[PDB]
Design an enzyme around this catalytic site. Structure first.
Site, PDB file in Angstrom:
ATOM      1  N   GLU E 179      -0.431  -4.865   4.212  1.00 50.65           N
ATOM      2  CA  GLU E 179       0.836  -4.366   3.667  1.00 50.65           C
ATOM      3  C   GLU E 179       1.460  -3.483   4.748  1.00 50.65           C
ATOM      4  O   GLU E 179       1.038  -3.524   5.908  1.00 50.65           O
ATOM      5  CB  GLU E 179       0.617  -3.680   2.303  1.00 50.65           C
ATOM      6  CG  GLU E 179      -0.467  -2.615   2.296  1.00 50.65           C
ATOM      7  CD  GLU E 179       0.026  -1.302   2.861  1.00 50.65           C
ATOM      8  OE1 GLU E 179       0.873  -0.657   2.203  1.00 50.65           O
ATOM      9  OE2 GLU E 179      -0.411  -0.941   3.980  1.00 50.65           O
ATOM     10  N   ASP E 204       1.053 -12.384  -2.085  1.00 53.34           N
ATOM     11  CA  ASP E 204       0.980 -13.507  -1.157  1.00 53.34           C
ATOM     12  C   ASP E 204      -0.474 -13.662  -0.768  1.00 53.34           C
ATOM     13  O   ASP E 204      -1.173 -12.662  -0.598  1.00 53.34           O
ATOM     14  CB  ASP E 204       1.803 -13.284   0.114  1.00 53.34           C
ATOM     15  CG  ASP E 204       3.237 -12.910  -0.176  1.00 53.34           C
ATOM     16  OD1 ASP E 204       3.499 -11.704  -0.388  1.00 53.34           O
ATOM     17  OD2 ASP E 204       4.094 -13.815  -0.179  1.00 53.34           O
TER      18      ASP E 204
END
Ligand SMILES: Clc1nc(SCc2ccccc2)c2[nH]cnc2n1
Ligand SMILES: Clc1nc(SCc2ccccc2)c2[nH]cnc2n1
Ligand SMILES: Clc1nc(SCc2ccccc2)c2[nH]cnc2n1
Lengths: 233, 233, 233, 233, 233, 233
Positions: E179, E204
């Site tokens: 992230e 994802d």
């Protein structure tokens, strides 16, 4: 006087053309300037002052590599009062956008040197030329009908690179050619509040494998020399 | 045969003496060699071949700065088959262990350059001379009555330093003097399996501010030259 | 079609104006464009398409910071086929060469980010705009009577700097102002062969401490907006 | 006393042999010294003082890795007044120039440690031994008919390297073997103005895949031990 | 007020949930809080205060990337007196240990940013959350029967990575997902002595190639939202 | 079976307690274990296997410094199949949040080492312990009435620091104490998918200069030992 220049203060005009090769500098003086005088010769690094179309202009060799170039540019600005510095050197093409003997104007000079990290807080200094000189080069090339190629160059501490595998990446990021001094010229002129620009003609092509002789590196680039003289007049 | 040297292959003897200043190379050729022939002059960077006490000896200028030095040394080894490279020059002393007209032999060359990180996995390359050559220098110096000062030098990308406040720390860590090429000479010679060494003469102390006279400078440099020529015999 | 933009492919014109603040994008759409349509709003980051003097023009917000800007610019180029990207915004001045309501054109973007080292072989990428776009900005500014201040900016990862003591050194090296995205805009556009430029308006001087009034801020930013819209015509 | 040594001031002779393994140190004391006394044993890191051919000499373990070695060497110099420090360790051969059980003298110690960047201005410290100790080792080996291998070593923070793919490059740059302390010994002795040298015998061969047992690493290297004792007498 | 938040001092409760997306923040306020009031909206970055099960809690958007997150967290702590900061974001899975929509608690946030080197002596800051918040998240997840995945995340300046070849290595070193803000949240909260924790849900999956729509990134993660609200009550 | 450990495969229990000092390992074996057997002693680095409350428990010394610790931990995991590694030791406090005889649990280990950059793509690895082990430590400490102090430590390559002026900044960023191995223990265990944790006892405060008495040091360390042995039960 300085350790590397033995001219008198005032021998240099405020506008100066530069090459790494002092024999290209001598060639320009003899072929293109009126009343040219040799004004310095320490370490065989020649410099001259003369006239082009009535306008005084100087010429100076800066040797090879960022460290060498930084020495002469530093002294030209701080001792000899040079205000505008136009490098007209040679370079190796790494981009398919340019061919042998093309003239490139360096809008920025990337580098594998540590000199700018030492200068600039260990951060990324984006070394760039003076915009007004860049504009003048663009406009003069158009007036002369010269096809000026415009983009970044990569200034390396290596002529014989250990990283040829990275040249395509460099070209992808708009580095048209590789040379060894522009980032030092640019960073020294930023340090010292002077106007600088780097033009270079393609003397080696890393895609087509072409290379000029040493004599051709002095004599084949009249177009870039005349461009330089015209923009400084 | 290379972009920067125009000698014929075979023009160089396998033992070469180097200086940054090509006019000092010229001085040595005319004063100390027999039958000296100029063999290269691209960019006014002169090289010579001659004899000293019947032994063939070559001389080559290498300019200022690691990048400049690496170009010439690479070409000398890889194209002209030079096997031993002895660099002599002046250096600014920073250590109280050395004084005017001392001669330093650099058994290590630290640097602020990024070149050895680029060459060597981004780690710390300890740039060192060939040991046998260093031993030869020490034995020849003793036979000539010279008290060789042995330690590190610091090879800088900056003649005009931005870190003069760090000279004392440099001296603490056994850096006797500052110059600008030894680390590149040494790293190139390690890369290419050649024997290299750097000797430098103290004409200026950057701390005490003591400086030699111009005739003492000539005299001091001639003593170096003789030491170098004697170890190549 | 991307995680961060929900416009339809084709919704964007190939020329896009960018701001960090999506409400400033909104302001421009409502005040200066004809037939403006909101085309994206993921994460409240608004984008618009409209006409200025009959010419199709898109607007997109990009948030704060190089990482945020790189996300949007990448998606705009690679998915939405944007070809020209003109960033306008405010910037904190650090140079005595600029003052309140000056407009700076960044011909280089230095940075304290690691992004360009990650992109570019761990070396120094000189992050520069497209030259033709910069020339277009200079010519349009002159025709509108704007005295464009040209130099570097410094793109920082820090709004609240830990290095305020270094602003003077930044200014010495021709960094006129600090902002937080130009280096990422420029590096992304070089990566992807798109034309980019950054203009920034001086509403605050971080050194002199001078600041514009809220109505002067609106007025200053509108002058920028018009300059941008005129060069995209 | 120090946190890591519990000898009295004066218990150490000014000349000290070092091994990482305190049991090799104990082995040497029992087999080769007269009137050997154990003088320290904190953390089981043994040290001794005794006589070889009438000359007082000390022995001390330094543990594994630069950080460990730096601790003991620092204390040996600053508290216990040790003047000459001769490391006689083990190493892994990466060069085809050397075989198992060869003795290498480290003319320089490259490293992947950050310790020397922390010590030395974030630049490249070329960590090197004292030249007179190096010369003494060369001459003593010749007098004894020992084939002393001479070149750089690479001092790593890793015994189990993540970079084995780079060993051939290391060997190309004259790194004969890999070990883990020489660069720390050398940099600490440079810091503190003391004389140090590193010898190591090849206990593992990364090309031929040979490796000695733990017992063999104590007992197989009498030739290097006797070389060390002879050069210090 | 601050340049990026236009709430009054005291509008924020001492416990604050954070998302990069201000529309996830708005979604939470409307669906899960009683008497929610919008308290800030500069740059469309919404923040709210309301009640969950009688306990006051605030919500705030932090935009994308370390630089953006650092701005809002810095202001939340120093101006608005926020004491506990719980990021509930999205992430890309790189480890086969986790699946789409799994909730990860970041025990540490590695990074390719330079921000922590600039903050922390150019050394390695291991950015970590407050242990008591981590413990509370673990215990609340157990009480709720949520399968909380626990490990490191990698916080990148790149959503579109240039180093995907390294993701398996990252996963080997216990990085479950990638992230772009946790390392900045963690380092800012360490700087300012505040309690912070990062949870992220997998939006994802880089191994299975799955990806949620923008709408799903707002609406699919009620389990992580309810976990956050329960641990703060 | 390895160069540094001479135990038989199977001699180690899958749970191992570690100390830098092998004599402290010995002390624990004789005082706290039943049926303790010495199983390794290469380089005097002792390891043991015994029982505590009927549970098999191993002990191993690891020396001083990240490089030393990484050797032993790697061999223990990869050759001797150790699965849980609990490091206990003393540490110099630098934070006002801890005082004499406090026990710190390191939920993160910062470092001035280059090892994690070498391991981890030249980026910042956040070196963290196994979370379940940390939770086990917290629950066991509470059941024994110990008020565990939780935060980062700083793992240094330097016992004798060159950066003591930076201890306050370290403390600001929630580094409670300095030691020299935790970051290597943690990075090795993440590399190899093993569970690791570091506890350290405050016997010296590097800021306030307060120090425990020798009998308080024994007493403080025994409390640690019992906490460690209890969490491995
Ligand atoms: Cl760094 C640089 N490289 C080159 S071609 C390098 C090159 C080396 C070996 C083989 C082919 C090409 C230049 N030509 C003029 N200036 C230059 N600067
Ligand atoms: Cl860094 C270092 N490596 C080695 S062999 C490493 C090695 C590891 C695994 C497999 C084969 C070889 C040494 N032998 C004695 N000292 C040493 N220092
Ligand atoms: Cl850095 C990061 N990457 C991802 S997936 C990147 C990704 C890019 C292209 C193709 C597939 C995957 C995230 N998803 C939610 N937050 C995130 N942060």
């Amino acid at each position: 006087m300085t350790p590397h220049i033995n001219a008198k203060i005032g021998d240099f005009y405020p506008q100066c053309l530069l090459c790494g090769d002092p024999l290209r500098v001598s060639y320009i003086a003899k072929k293109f300037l009126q009343d040219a005088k040799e004004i310095t010769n320490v370490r065989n690094m020649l410099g001259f002052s003369g006239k082009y179309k009535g306008r005084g202009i100087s010429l100076m060799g800066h040797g090879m590599g960022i460290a060498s170039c930084t020495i002469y540019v530093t002294e030209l600005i701080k001792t000899y009062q040079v205000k505008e510095l136009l490098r007209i050197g040679t370079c190796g093409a790494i981009s398919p956008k340019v061919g042998l003997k093309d003239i490139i104007m360096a809008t920025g000079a990337s580098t594998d040197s540590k000199t700018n990290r030492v200068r600039f807080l260990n951060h990324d200094l984006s070394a760039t030329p003076d915009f007004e000189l860049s504009l003048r080069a663009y406009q003069t090339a158009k007036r002369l009908g010269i096809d000026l190629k415009v983009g970044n160059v990569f200034s390396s501490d290596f002529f014989y690179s250990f990283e040829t595998h990275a040249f395509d990446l460099m070209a992808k990021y708009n580095h048209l050619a590789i040379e060894m001094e522009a980032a030092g010229l640019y960073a020294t002129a930023m340090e010292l509040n002077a106007k600088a620009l780097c033009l270079c003609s393609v003397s080696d092509h890393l895609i087509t494998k072409e290379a000029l002789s040493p004599k051709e590196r002095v004599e084949s680039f009249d177009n870039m020399i005349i461009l330089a003289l015209e923009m400084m007049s």
